[PDB]
Structures are given as C-alpha cells and as structure tokens.
Scaffold this active site. Sequence first.
Site, short mmCIF file in Angstrom:
data_model
loop_
_atom_site.label_atom_id
_atom_site.label_comp_id
_atom_site.label_asym_id
_atom_site.label_seq_id
_atom_site.Cartn_x
_atom_site.Cartn_y
_atom_site.Cartn_z
N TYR F 108 0.82 -1.20 0.00
CA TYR F 108 0.00 0.00 0.00
C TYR F 108 0.86 1.26 0.00
O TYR F 108 1.91 1.34 0.66
CB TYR F 108 -0.86 0.05 1.24
CG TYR F 108 -2.05 -0.89 1.24
CD1 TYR F 108 -3.27 -0.49 0.70
CD2 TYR F 108 -1.97 -2.15 1.81
CE1 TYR F 108 -4.38 -1.33 0.73
CE2 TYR F 108 -3.07 -2.99 1.83
CZ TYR F 108 -4.27 -2.58 1.30
OH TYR F 108 -5.37 -3.39 1.33
N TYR F 147 -1.77 -9.55 1.06
CA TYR F 147 -1.13 -8.63 2.04
C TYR F 147 -0.88 -9.35 3.40
O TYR F 147 -1.86 -9.70 4.05
CB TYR F 147 -2.01 -7.35 2.26
CG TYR F 147 -1.37 -6.35 3.21
CD1 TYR F 147 -0.25 -5.64 2.80
CD2 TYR F 147 -1.86 -6.12 4.48
CE1 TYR F 147 0.37 -4.74 3.64
CE2 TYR F 147 -1.24 -5.22 5.34
CZ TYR F 147 -0.13 -4.52 4.90
OH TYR F 147 0.51 -3.65 5.75
N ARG F 157 -4.12 -11.33 3.92
CA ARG F 157 -5.37 -10.94 3.29
C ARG F 157 -5.42 -11.54 1.90
O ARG F 157 -4.41 -11.52 1.20
CB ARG F 157 -5.48 -9.42 3.14
CG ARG F 157 -5.42 -8.60 4.41
CD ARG F 157 -6.45 -8.98 5.46
NE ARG F 157 -7.75 -9.38 4.94
CZ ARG F 157 -8.67 -8.58 4.37
NH1 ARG F 157 -8.47 -7.29 4.15
NH2 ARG F 157 -9.82 -9.11 3.99
N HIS F 160 -7.66 -8.01 -2.52
CA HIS F 160 -8.91 -7.30 -2.28
C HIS F 160 -8.85 -5.83 -2.64
O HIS F 160 -7.78 -5.21 -2.60
CB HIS F 160 -9.37 -7.47 -0.83
CG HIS F 160 -8.47 -6.80 0.15
ND1 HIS F 160 -7.25 -7.33 0.50
CD2 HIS F 160 -8.57 -5.62 0.81
CE1 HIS F 160 -6.65 -6.52 1.33
NE2 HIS F 160 -7.42 -5.47 1.54
N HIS F 162 -10.84 -2.31 -1.39
CA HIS F 162 -11.76 -1.65 -0.50
C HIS F 162 -12.73 -0.77 -1.30
O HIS F 162 -12.33 -0.10 -2.25
CB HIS F 162 -11.00 -0.78 0.51
CG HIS F 162 -10.06 -1.54 1.39
ND1 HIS F 162 -10.39 -1.94 2.67
CD2 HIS F 162 -8.80 -1.97 1.19
CE1 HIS F 162 -9.38 -2.59 3.21
NE2 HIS F 162 -8.40 -2.62 2.33
O1 LIG Z 1 -6.69 -5.09 4.36
C1 LIG Z 1 -5.77 -4.66 5.26
C2 LIG Z 1 -5.26 -5.50 6.25
C3 LIG Z 1 -4.32 -5.04 7.16
C4 LIG Z 1 -3.89 -3.72 7.08
F1 LIG Z 1 -2.98 -3.27 7.96
C5 LIG Z 1 -4.41 -2.88 6.10
C6 LIG Z 1 -5.35 -3.35 5.19
O2 LIG Z 1 -5.88 -2.55 4.23
FE LIG Z 2 -6.62 -3.84 2.74
#
Ligand SMILES: Oc1ccc(F)cc1O
Ligand SMILES: [Fe+3]
Lengths: 200, 200, 200, 200, 238, 238, 238
Positions: F108, F147, F157, F160, F162
């Site tokens: 991210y 992730y 994760r 995905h 959001h």
């Molecule tokens: O989906 C996620 C999972 C953990 C995090 F720290 C941020 C995210 O966007």
């Molecule tokens: Fe996320």
Amino acid sequence: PIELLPETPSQTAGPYVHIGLALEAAGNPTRDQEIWNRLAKPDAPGEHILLLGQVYDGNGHLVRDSFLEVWQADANGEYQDAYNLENAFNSFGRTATTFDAGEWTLHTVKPGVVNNAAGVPMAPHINISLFARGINIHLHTRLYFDDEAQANAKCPVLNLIEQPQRRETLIAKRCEVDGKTAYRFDIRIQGEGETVFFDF
Amino acid sequence: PIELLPETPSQTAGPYVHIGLALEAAGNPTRDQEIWNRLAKPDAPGEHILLLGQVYDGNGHLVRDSFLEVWQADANGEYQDAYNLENAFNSFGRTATTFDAGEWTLHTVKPGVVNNAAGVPMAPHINISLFARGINIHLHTRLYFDDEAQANAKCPVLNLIEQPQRRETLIAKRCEVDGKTAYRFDIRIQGEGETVFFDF
Amino acid sequence: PIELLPETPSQTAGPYVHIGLALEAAGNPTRDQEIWNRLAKPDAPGEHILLLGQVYDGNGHLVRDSFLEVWQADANGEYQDAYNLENAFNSFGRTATTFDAGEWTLHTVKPGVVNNAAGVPMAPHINISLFARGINIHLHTRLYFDDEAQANAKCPVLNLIEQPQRRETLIAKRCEVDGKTAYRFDIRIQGEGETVFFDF
Amino acid sequence: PIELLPETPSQTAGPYVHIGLALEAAGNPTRDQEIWNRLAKPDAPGEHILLLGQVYDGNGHLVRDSFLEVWQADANGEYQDAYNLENAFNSFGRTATTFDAGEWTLHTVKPGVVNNAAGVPMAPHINISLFARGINIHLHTRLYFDDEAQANAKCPVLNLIEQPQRRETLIAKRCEVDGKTAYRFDIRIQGEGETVFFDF
Amino acid sequence: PAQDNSRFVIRDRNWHPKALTPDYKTSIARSPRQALVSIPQSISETTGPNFSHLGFGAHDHDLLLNFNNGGLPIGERIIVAGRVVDQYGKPVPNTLVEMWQANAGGRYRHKNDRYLAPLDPNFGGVGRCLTDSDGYYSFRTIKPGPYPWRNGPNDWRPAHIHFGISGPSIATKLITQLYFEGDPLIPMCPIVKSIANPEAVQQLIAKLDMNNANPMDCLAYRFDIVLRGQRKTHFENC
Amino acid sequence: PAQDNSRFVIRDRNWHPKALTPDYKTSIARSPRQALVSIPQSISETTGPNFSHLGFGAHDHDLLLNFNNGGLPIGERIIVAGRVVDQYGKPVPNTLVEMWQANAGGRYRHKNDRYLAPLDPNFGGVGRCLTDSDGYYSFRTIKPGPYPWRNGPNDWRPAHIHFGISGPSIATKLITQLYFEGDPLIPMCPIVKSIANPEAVQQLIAKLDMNNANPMDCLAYRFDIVLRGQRKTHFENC
Amino acid sequence: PAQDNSRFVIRDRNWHPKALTPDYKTSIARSPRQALVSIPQSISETTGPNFSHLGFGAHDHDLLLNFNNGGLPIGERIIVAGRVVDQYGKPVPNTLVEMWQANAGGRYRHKNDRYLAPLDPNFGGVGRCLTDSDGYYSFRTIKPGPYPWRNGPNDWRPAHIHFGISGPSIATKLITQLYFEGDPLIPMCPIVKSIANPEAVQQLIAKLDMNNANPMDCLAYRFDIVLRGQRKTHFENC
Ligand SMILES: Oc1ccc(F)cc1O
Ligand SMILES: [Fe+3]
Ligand SMILES: O=C(O)C[C@H]1C=CC(=O)O1
Ligand SMILES: O=C(O)C[C@H]1C=CC(=O)O1
Ligand SMILES: O=C(O)C[C@H]1C=CC(=O)O1
Ligand SMILES: O=C(O)C[C@H]1C=CC(=O)O1
Ligand SMILES: Oc1ccc(F)cc1O
Ligand SMILES: Oc1ccc(F)cc1O
Ligand SMILES: Oc1ccc(F)cc1O
Ligand SMILES: Oc1ccc(F)cc1O
Ligand SMILES: Oc1ccc(F)cc1O
Ligand SMILES: Oc1ccc(F)cc1O
Ligand SMILES: Oc1ccc(F)cc1O
Ligand SMILES: Oc1ccc(F)cc1O
Ligand SMILES: Oc1ccc(F)cc1O
Ligand SMILES: Oc1ccc(F)cc1O
Ligand SMILES: Oc1ccc(F)cc1O
Ligand SMILES: Oc1ccc(F)cc1O
Ligand SMILES: [Cl-]
Ligand SMILES: [Fe+3]
Ligand SMILES: [Fe+3]
Ligand SMILES: [Fe+3]
C-alpha cells in the site's frame, strides 16, 4: 465467471437457401423489393467495378449453391447503413453462384480507405460472409484489390495473417469484362490455396 | 489392473521457451554456464561434424521457434551422461532455430555404433526431441547418416518403420558448410515427406 | 490448499498436574531424578538470581494450582539443550505455585542477550509457559528485567506489542530476598494489568 | 415471508482507509476536489464553531486511525444535500484522527433544530458515522451540545436511551480552541463511559 | 559412461494431450498426421544427461534476486516448491528442474512478446535448480499474470509457470506448465484443454501451501511432479 | 434542501459481520459491549449527500493513469465494473463509489505500511466515480496482491479492493471489500470470516467477466452492490 | 550450543480449544481477554530441552510396578502405546512423554482430591519415558475410572490419562488428555467440548489395540500424537 444468455446456435443455410434469400435463383417470382447484387446505381460517385468469382470445395469442385453477403464502404470510406433501393449506393448486398457455371457477380464501386479502431488505415476491402449447404456457420473473409499493393502491405488486418503466402489468398485480380473494370475473387474453402477466414 | 501414479501431463513449451532454455535467443543475458549446441571440444576423439536443419509445418512453412534436445553416443559408442562444460565431449545438447532463417546448428562428432537391447548393432544415430509452440508433447526422432547406407539397411530400429520410403525421412544428407563436413537434417512435422516420429 | 496432519489438540493440565510434573507438591514421593526449579548450581557462571511471582485470575484471586515451564539462555546468551542434572547450568526448568501462599520460585542466573532471526538483539528474557486448571492451552509469555531499560526499549519482540503500557506487564521488578538479588514477576491472566501473552 | 435481495455485507475500512478517503493523511497527493472537514465558508449563516475529539478503545488507548463522516443541518435547520465545494455550507463532511495526537477536527456551524417524523423537535445534533481498523461495520452516534440542556432534555431521540447516565455520553463539552468557540466530543468505543451507538 | 539398466513405464498418450487439438490453433499445422512408430527401449532411450556437475550460480533458483537491476520485482512474492517422484513413488534426486514465466503483469522478457504490459526492470523470469537427495526442489519468484494471446479473439492464458524436468533418461524428460489453485481462467484455456481428461488437468494445478510460507514476506505454492516409473530389466533375451 | 420522503429497510446485523469477532484481533477492543440503541428514521437518517456536483478529474476512475510518473503500472490489468441496486432491485444512479487498494505485490501507498514489497512508481491505488443513470460504475486498475498482516503469526489478506458507496442517505452508506473469484486465501481470512453466514461472504466475491474484457489489453471482474431497500412512507402519524 | 535451524508450522487455534469455553467453568476467569501477540520465531522459540540423558528409573514407564507396596494394583491391566510424529509425518525420537492419571475407581493420589473413592495402596498414577529412535513410546498401567467434579451439578470426566510431550522445541511442547474408545461420557464432558471441532476430539480417543495385548495378562490401547510440523528455514533475510 459471468455467463450471459448463450447465442442462438448457427445451422447450415442448406441447398434451398435461395427460396428465402435469392428468390429468382430458386426458380420463383420476386417481391416488389429485393436485396441483391447491385450496390451502386450508375450515378454513384467512385470507380464503378464488377466483382466476380467462383467457390471451390476441398476436392477442387465448384460449390454451385453458395450464397454470399457483402458489406463495404462507399468511395469516400463511409459505411452506409440506411438500406434503401432508392439510394445511389448501398453498403450491403447479396449474391449467389449460378447452378450451371458456379459464378457469382456484384456491381459496385471500389471502397475507400477506413481506419481500424486504433486509427490505422486498412487497405480497401469488401467484407464477405459465405453460406451454403455443408457450411454449418458462415465463413467470414475479405476481398482486397491487387492494384492496392502499397496499402495492402501496410494493412493491420492483413498483417495479422502470420504467413505472407496466405495473405495472397485475399487479393482479387484486376481484369476487364466486356469493356468494364472487374476483379476476380475465387474462394477455396479447403486445401490447396485455402482462403483465409476470420473470427471476430 | 495395477495402476501406478499417473505421469504429470505434457504441455507445449510455447513460443517463449528460449527465456528458460535458450537465453541468448530470447534476447537476454546468459548465465555463467549454459547447456547449448557445442557437444565437442576441438580435441574430442572422432570425426568432427556440423549438423544443421530447418523445421517445416504442414503448410510447408518454417517453424522458426523450435527448440531441440539431442542425445548421442561419442565416437567410441559411449554415452557420456556426466554433463559438464569442461568435458571433451557431452552426449547431450540443445539448439534452437534462428528466427530469421529458421535454421538450427549443432557442433559434434559422428556417433559410434551402439547395440540394442537384444545385442543387435544400431546404425550411427542422434536421438532428437523437438519442442515448440503448437507441439503439445515433444516429438522424438532419430538422425541417421547418408554415408552409412550399409549400417542403415540393417538397423533394427529403422527396420521397424514398415515402409522404406518413410525410412528415408531419417537419413541426413552429407554436405559442406564453410568447407567443413556437415549433415543436413530437415524435419517435416506434417504432410508430404512427414518425418518419422517414435514412441518409446 | 496443502493440509498437513492436524496437531493433537491441547487440553487443560487440570488441578492434579503435580502428580505427573511436580511430585512433591502433590504430596507424593519423588524419583531419583526430577526436573525442577534450580537451573543453576552455585559454580555456574553469571549473576545468580532468585525469581519469584504470583499468578492472578480475572477476579484478582490467586491461582494456587499454576504450573510453569521456563526456557532461558545462559549468562553468555547460549541456549543449553542437553538437559542433565550434573550440569552447572540447564536452560530448562519447572516450578509451581504453593497452595497456601500462591508463590512460585526459580533459582537461576540472569540470561545473556540473544539475537532474533534477523540478527537484532533481544533484551535479556526468560521464556515462560503457564499451565493450570481452567487454561485449555498453555499461555506463552516473557520475563524481562527492570534493570535492562535501555535494552528493553530496543527489543524487537517488546516493540511488537502495540501499546507501551502493555509492554510494562513483562518487566520483572528487582528486589532483595534474604540478602540475595531477586526479581518479582506477577502474571495477571485476565483484566486489569493483563499480562501480554504470545503466539508463535 | 417476503425476503428481498440481501444487502452487501460490511467489512472494516482497515488502517489504510486514508488512501481512499483522506489522501493527505495517508501521506499522498490530493486531487483537485476533496471531501473534507470544512463544512462552512467564512460567510455561511450561523454560529461558526470548531468540533474536535479523540476516540478511545476498550483499554483506554487512542484509536489513531479512525475515520469519521458527519451529516448535520445548516444553521436554519435545513439539510444541504447538493454537495459542492463552492457551497457556502455543506451538510456533509469527513475527518480523521491525527496519528500522533489521535485528534480529529471539524469546522462548521451550530446546526438548527429539525423535527422528527412525528413532528417533535430534536435537539441540535451532528450525525456521526465512525470507521476504523477493527470496526467491522461503522458505528452511528450523535453529537449534541452542552449549552442546549433544555432542548436535550426534551429530545425524542435522547429519550430513547433508557438510562440518563448513558445520555450524557452524547453531550459535547463547550470549550475554546485558539480563543474560538469549540465543542469537544470524545468517543469511547468500549467499557467505562461507552458512547451510545444507534441502529436505524 | 552410461549403461542400459532399467525400463520406463510406457506413456499413456490419452492422459497427455494429443498432438491435434484444433482449439489450440497452432497445433493444427504442427501435429503429425502419421502414427508414431513404437520402438523397444535400448540404451539410447534409457539413458540421459545427469546435471550434478553443472555449475549453478548462487541465485539461479531465486527470481527475486537473479535479475537484480537496483531493486526488487513488483508482484506477489511466492515460493514454488515440490517433489519429483516416479510413478512407483520413488524420489528422483539430483535432477534438473528449469522454469520460465512472465512478470506480474503477464509480460514476458522475450524479443517476440508484443503485449503492451510493461517489463519489470528487476525481473527476468528464468530459474533452474537440481532436486535434492530426497527429490525436493524450491524456487522463489513472483506470481505471473495472465497473458492475452492471438488464438481466439478473447483468449487469455491462466497465470502459469513453464517447467522442464530432465529425470533419469531422455525417455523421462518432460515439459509442462504449472497453474494456480482456483484460477477461473483454467477451465477456459484451449492449451489446458489440450488435455482431454479433467483429472489430468488437476495434476497441473499447484496448491497454496501456507505451511511453507514465510510470514510477513512471501506465500508458497506446492507442485509435485511425477515422471515415468523406472524398473529393473527382467527376463530379457531368454 | 433535502426532504424526508422515504424509509430504508432495517439492516440484518446477522448478515453483516458482528462487532466482536475475536479471530480478527483488533475487533476485541474496538467493539461496543452495550447494545445498539434503535431509533426511528427521521430526516436526519433518511437524507444524505448527493455528489453529482463534485468535480471529478478525467482519470479519477482509472488507476492505470491517475498516478502517472513516467509509465504504466506493473500488474494484471483489469476493469472492475458492476451495478449498484437497492434490495428491491432498483438501480441507484449518480451515487459515489470510491475504492482503494494495494499494488500488484500487496504494498500500500500509505505511510503506515511497513511491508517490504516495493512501491510501484506508477501506481497510487485510489479511484472514484459516480454510477451512471442506470446504476453502473466502472474502474480500471491492476489486480492487487495478497497482504501479510500482524494478526495471527501467518495471516494473509486475500487479494482485495476496499469499496465505499454513499447511496441515497446516510442510512445506506456502506464500506466493504471486494475479493476475487477462486482465491484460496478467502476461506482462511479472519476479516472475511467476521461474516458468519457463508452466503453473505459469497456476495463479496467478484466474478471474472470475459464479456467486459478488452482483448490483448485487460481482463475484467464484475462486482454488484446491493444497498438497503428504499420505499415511500405510508400510513404514518395516523 | 542449541541452534536456530528450523521453523514450526503455525498452530491452528480453532483446532485447539479456545481459552474462553464457559461450560468449563474455571476457564471463565482464567482466559485472557486481550488478543495474543504474534511474534516471529527466533532461537528462543525454536529450541528446547533434550532429555536423552535424564536418568530414568527401571519402572518409570510401568505404573503396575512403580508404586509397589506389597502387591499389584487393582484394575484393568493395559498397555498404552503409540508414536509421536510431526505434522509432516516425521517421527519424533528421543522425546519426553509424561503421563498421570487416577486409579481404577477415579481417585487421584493428590492431597487436593477429596473424592470418596479409595486410594489403591499399590498405585501412584505417574509415568514417564522417552520415545525410541523410531518415535514409539510405551506405558503399562491400569485403566483409570471416571471422575466426578464440581463443574455442573452432575459432571463426570470420562476415563482419561493426562499426557505431556516435549518435542524438539518449546514451540512444540503440548499437554493433552487421552480418552478411551467407546466411552459414553466423552460427548458429555465440557473439557472435551472445549474443543469445538468434533474431528479434533476424535484425535484424543485411544483405540483398543488387540494386536498389542498380552493374552491372559493385559489389554492395550493405541494413542498416536502429532506435534507441530518442523521444516528447515528458507529464503530468510534476503
Ligand atoms: O486489508 C488490510 C489488512 C491489514 C492492514 F494493515 C491494512 C489493510 O488494508
Ligand atoms: Fe486492505
Ligand atoms: O488465386 C489467388 O492467388 C488469389 C485468390 C484471390 C482472388 C482470386 O481470384 O484467387
Ligand atoms: O532429404 C530428405 O528428404 C530426407 C530428410 C532427412 C534429412 C533431410 O535433410 O531431409
Ligand atoms: O506489575 C507490573 O507493572 C509488572 C508485572 C511484571 C512483573 C511484576 O511483578 O508485575
Ligand atoms: O465528557 C464526557 O464524558 C461526555 C462525552 C461527550 C462529549 C465528550 O467529550 O465526552
Ligand atoms: O434442410 C434441408 C435438407 C436437405 C436439403 F437438400 C435441403 C434442405 O433445406
Ligand atoms: O503483406 C502482404 C499483403 C498481401 C499479400 F498478398 C502479401 C503480403 O506479404
Ligand atoms: O503461454 C504462452 C502463450 C502464448 C505465447 F505466445 C507464449 C506463451 O508462453
Ligand atoms: O532400409 C532402409 C533404411 C534407410 C532408408 F533410407 C531406406 C531403407 O530401405
Ligand atoms: O480431570 C480432572 C478433573 C477435575 C479435577 F479436579 C482434576 C482432574 O484431573
Ligand atoms: O518500549 C517499552 C519497553 C518496555 C516498557 F516497560 C515500556 C516501553 O515503552
Ligand atoms: O435527558 C437527558 C439528556 C441528556 C443528558 F445528558 C442527561 C439527561 O437526563
Ligand atoms: O493421425 C491423425 C490423422 C487424422 C486425424 F484427424 C487425427 C490423427 O491423429
Ligand atoms: O484476436 C485479436 C484480438 C485483438 C488484437 F489486437 C489482435 C487479434 O488478433
Ligand atoms: O455486547 C456484547 C457483550 C458481550 C459479548 F460477549 C458479546 C456482545 O455482543
Ligand atoms: O506474527 C509476526 C510474524 C512475523 C513478523 F515479522 C512479525 C509478527 O508479528
Ligand atoms: O456434593 C456435591 C454434588 C454436586 C456438586 F455440584 C457439588 C457438590 O459439593
Ligand atoms: Cl483411601
Ligand atoms: Fe431445409
Ligand atoms: Fe506462457
Ligand atoms: Fe484428570
């Protein structure tokens, strides 16, 4: 995955396709208005041309019951979809092979250049769809012109045919038929010299 | 019946096989050691020869993306399996067709005679496996030599090919490349002159 | 996905765990060799320390039937896995809370610094596993020392605890017990001041 | 019974919600227009006020990654739904807690009174929706004002909270920030002083 | 030198893809029309190269580091590991496993790839290793992206890694492709579907392997490979 | 200004995830322990912002172009499109849809992300648009990577994106996550599993949509969104 | 001189019993309310004691002889035997297995047990041994009786033997309980039912093993134990 409604499946037109789509050739009367093989009236702008050809099966024998539909730009490279027998030019027409000789004819003008979706010029062409007994789903091809060699060499559609030798199958041969400019375009469905057919 | 674990199924090598197995051909840097097309150091025992060939599809067009693996006895009829770039001779090698000319080359020695499992001498031969885009499982063949006619006529493997005309497809033609002894072995995957392919 | 054999599931040790693992505390005779709470003989190198503590439930009441296992480096920061009662030092031991007072004791030396898997020094610590009636799977924690503040502040394990206030729960308090250096380490299983417990 | 299509289920916004909804806070460049925390241009009608607050978890620790959306009447008791950065007043806005101090701010006007569906006046209020890592579906609350005690005591929404002590959790405290009129509205998600959250 | 000391179980050429699979268009003109000629196994077929003395570079199995031009590749970090066994279940040790693949966006580092998706300056797409003494291999890479290609008018390869495995003889050598658990492109691909038997397709699908993952670092997939069964010769020439 | 002219179907808070879902560890201290207080709908709840007059940049919906620093992002090019409807099946036109995501490797672009996977210099990870007059939205992006995160000791994760959707009122506003058809991480994720009902989880799984793909260019996924049903008020105050 | 050379597969804490299982009443106040904090494996976690040179007495594994006060214990003579393996199926040799239990009537030899059933003067209820080089352990004992306990108003433990197993590291150490095939108390026990998954409960039920019995002497039960899978480190710090 996402599945849409399935398309209605194709079937052969069969050998009596002319009952429905080429009434005279069936041996029957015509209606007041028919869709047929003269795309251009004499006053239509452009170079007036006769197109003609024969269709061959995998054994080298004439396909005498072929039915063809064509779609082409006008001389200015514009597609004219408003079909009307009053028009000097229509982009669409139909033809069929004679049962004795196996030859089809079309009366039209040479199409102008039209760009593909990426803005790249395509060489002048006529889009053809071929139907007959034995053909379960129609075959798509293109008729290009042997006097457009420079344009043909740069056509982004012709260049998708991997082998140069196969590109040659799409090039109609200029000639003269009773004093008029003509191009002959034979189609070989199968085997030696097999015509390139498209999916899109 | 007794059913063992099934073998992992084959898939095509695809047209980018060179990335993995012929790095220079892909347009990429090479690693310190590569398995490639020079089986013999200059001082290896035997008669030093060049092998070359082109690969044709069913339409007679060059297969420009073919990848070949070879396995042969050394000049003394011994298979040298301990692969090493420092060996005087490796029985194994790899090659690929050039994309422009469609030609592969191999630098090796003429293989000595080896016996089959029943103790019958086989004529001098190179074992070849052919991979490419469009080839779902590799094709096995053998390259024999046109100047070994007497041995070829008695080879217990060539004799398993029912038709003498088909045996001819496995016989490489002696020639000279840059004045040096060579043999040309063209492969026709499909159609007229189709090369014999083996299962074992 | 790939699924391995499942691990045998945990169950509570129950209130009679000392029958099996702390024989004297059950009120029973001992065997010739027992695993117990003196990790260091007097001649072991390092700073000799007494550790002691009480264990509290979520209502603030003593857990009088606690059983603890400990694992720590020697004074030079090396783990000694060759368990032997003849050794001056063992890295492993066991203790339990007294039923009347609820206090456990350990006799050891202060552990040296050991690096984590990325090569980053961890502050001096004792690894603890806590078992009892009511505890279905044992609780993992660490005992750090309040006189190692600089090292504790930089410990890569302590720094994985998001809230500084919770890090404080893992810091044993230096004191003196009948003239000897000692550290008190109370554990609160639940609620106010809840001790950090680890998964790994 | 009649079952409609199910609503898409909620998920946590996660700790990187700022990437999408609070770009500057993520550490990233902003777009030409952003939806943010200044609801009123300087000349908007009404009493200009600052709102600020911190958000606490069940352990009393700051929730430093919270994201808030707000919806309120303008000073004349009208909801201005046609969102536009050129509006004198927007009824909608967004804010987020700073990561260092855990504090959010909003610049707005004190909302005018609006009636509920039965025609009964509600005390002046801000509707708030709270999102964060760890919050699986957003929490709805209302911010009321401590200098509207008479209206608050008669509010038909506050009166649906059974215990007067819990009503107190929704009453923001008048204060001054940089000498300007402000109201502080701290939210406690869990435990002592837990803020009332609504379903509707 | 090599000796003829074993036999290899005959291939099931209905388990493998056939040569002519016309939905995979390039197979039409590149498939023999005559039958293969069966020949008995001899030393020529039952021996092959062993690569124990091939010199491998330190990062030959690690595609995250073996094309290092200033940083790490962009993409889903994964270990790809498994075991090579024969059909009798015997491990195949010290065997050459080679692999090649596109980058995270489906772009190949090959002069003939005309797909518009960009190259990754830190990714080459080539690995090799030798199985260990127990038959296990391991690579580290990024998960490749699907690849559009000029077959039908909207055809896309599933995410895949090309594999080559030498095994004990030229009779065992195999090229194949690894696909990834759950990929919805797999049932749609005409190359996958060159394999007629759905159970054979399943053998090419690598499984997510959480046990082999490095937390906070990389995931893992497991892909076991089965080569032709090898047995001793018996009752020959009598 | 806005008027109270409708009612919204009451939420099923057993279809949604509950607040306390302890396997998702951060939910433990961030979940209320008192019951929510139910209140009747008023103008405060049945109105909300409309974003028709928000100024959108030309590339706000196109993550391949909206963080342009000299080239294209690395990764699986995809269109993400769908329809927003309410529970009665009525389209929700001119509604704000926002999305954010990691890059192809699961990194991210946020100051607080400490994962070692690299940033992509041509990828930001943010999009927004308005549904059209028939309820449809469309984004172009790259498929995000899984992730790893500090929940359990080896939690990841699934891939995905959001999503946030405004809808007609503050009562309809929703934040959710889109997952991808077939991803083997989905059944393992404690955030996914905050939703107790497996049928509700399935509603978050976007389907591969070959019909919407651009051949030789990008694939496509379809993700439809259902907001609370809206009806006219009836028989109130009498 | 212990070294960090291995990693242990992360525990499935939904396969194990959770901490808070209120029908087991004592768990209510003895369960953490905060989430466990996940930490990466270091040498602190991946090492542990090796008991190869702990001095065992001749009868430490034989509860029929290790509390001899004039005769044999009363009760069902049984051998309890099995194998300790890890999740990859690898034996765990030279590992410490400890066990404790009540006598034939459900009475424990512990000062805090006030159940009215009598002690057996020839029974203590404690055993220990080391697994052999192939991972196998063996005890001889009497089958314990069920045990009433002050949980609910009529709760009874099934017949059971408590087990502790060290394994290769402090990360593998486990305490559990063995139950006996067919015992109708098993499904009724709130300690058994602290395990949510019925398949996990089945892993604690020892099977009657007639093949291991001594005719005219003693019966036998088989109880295999699976510890966390152990693997070599790979691709770390790079
Ligand atoms: O989906 C996620 C999972 C953990 C995090 F720290 C941020 C995210 O966007
Ligand atoms: Fe996320
Ligand atoms: O025969 C050819 O080479 C070309 C083909 C296209 C027109 C025609 O008459 O035949
Ligand atoms: O000349 C032929 O037709 C035979 C075949 C085998 C070698 C080669 O070059 O072609
Ligand atoms: O009480 C504390 O703050 C710390 C905790 C750690 C050692 C001890 O005795 O209690
Ligand atoms: O002060 C309180 O406890 C009430 C609550 C509402 C506003 C605020 O700041 O906290
Ligand atoms: O359907 C048909 C079948 C055979 C034939 F000759 C003509 C047709 O129309
Ligand atoms: O590019 C070409 C186009 C038409 C043709 F006949 C031959 C070609 O090589
Ligand atoms: O898998 C592939 C598909 C088409 C192509 F051109 C190359 C490949 O490697
Ligand atoms: O037996 C033969 C061997 C090779 C060949 F070319 C022809 C034959 O008849
Ligand atoms: O299994 C048990 C149950 C209750 C108790 F007090 C002790 C035990 O060992
Ligand atoms: O980093 C820390 C470490 C130990 C402690 F007690 C407090 C801290 O803030
Ligand atoms: O009715 C009330 C309203 C707000 C408040 F803080 C207390 C009350 O009793
Ligand atoms: O050898 C073949 C020939 C024709 C055909 F249709 C399939 C074959 O496998
Ligand atoms: O089938 C095709 C689709 C798109 C394209 F650009 C070229 C093709 O040959
Ligand atoms: O409000 C709650 C309180 C305790 C609990 F375990 C669950 C809840 O939803
Ligand atoms: O659970 C963890 C796993 C790996 C790591 F680096 C940190 C963690 O907290
Ligand atoms: O005698 C008893 C019987 C049942 C119980 F739950 C407690 C007792 O003390
Ligand atoms: Cl007694
Ligand atoms: Fe008919
Ligand atoms: Fe490929
Ligand atoms: Fe017990």
